[PDB]
Amino acid sequence: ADDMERIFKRFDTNGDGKISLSELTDALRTLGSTSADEVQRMMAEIDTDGDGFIDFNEFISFCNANPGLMKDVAKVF
């Protein structure tokens, strides 16, 4: 099982290692999420400097998985 790891490695298929948040924040609701806009407008204030990508540390900074935004999203689809 996995909460965010099931998504991280999923988006981490480019070649470098980071994931385009702009694509993640938009590739969440399409899976069944709900609070996608919560980061869609705060993906550059959570950690990302502005480039539009994240290695891992910056990716987990948003994956609080508190309310169940990530704890119940990697199993949805």
From Swiss-Prot:
Per its UniProt record, what CDD domains does this chain match?
EFh
User: Where does the EF-hand domain lie?
Assistant: 1-34, 34-69
Which positions bind Ca(2+) 1? 12, 14, 16, 18, 23
Keywords of the record: Allergen, Calcium, Metal-binding, Repeat
Fetch the InterPro entries from UniProt.
EF-hand-dom_pair, EF_Hand_1_Ca_BS, EF_hand_dom, EF_hand_pair_protein_CML-like
Gene3D superfamilies recorded: EF-hand (1.10.238.10)
What does the record say about tissue specificity? Specifically expressed in pollen.
Q: Name one GO molecular function term.
A: calcium ion binding
Q: At which positions is Ca(2+) 2 bound?
A: 47, 49, 51, 58
Tagged with keyword Ribonucleoprotein = no
Q: Which domain of life is it from?
A: Eukaryota
The keyword Calcium belongs to this UniProt entry's keyword annotation: yes
Report any Pfam family annotated for this entry: EF-hand_7
Assembly, per entry: Monomer.
Instruction: List, alphabetically, the PANTHER family matched.
Output: EF-HAND CALCIUM-BINDING DOMAIN CONTAINING PROTEIN
Q: What does this protein do?
A: May be involved in the regulation of pollen-tube growth.
Q: What is this protein called?
A: Polcalcin Phl p 7
Organism lineage string = Eukaryota, Viridiplantae, Streptophyta, Embryophyta, Tracheophyta
- In the UniProt record, the gene name given for this protein reads P7
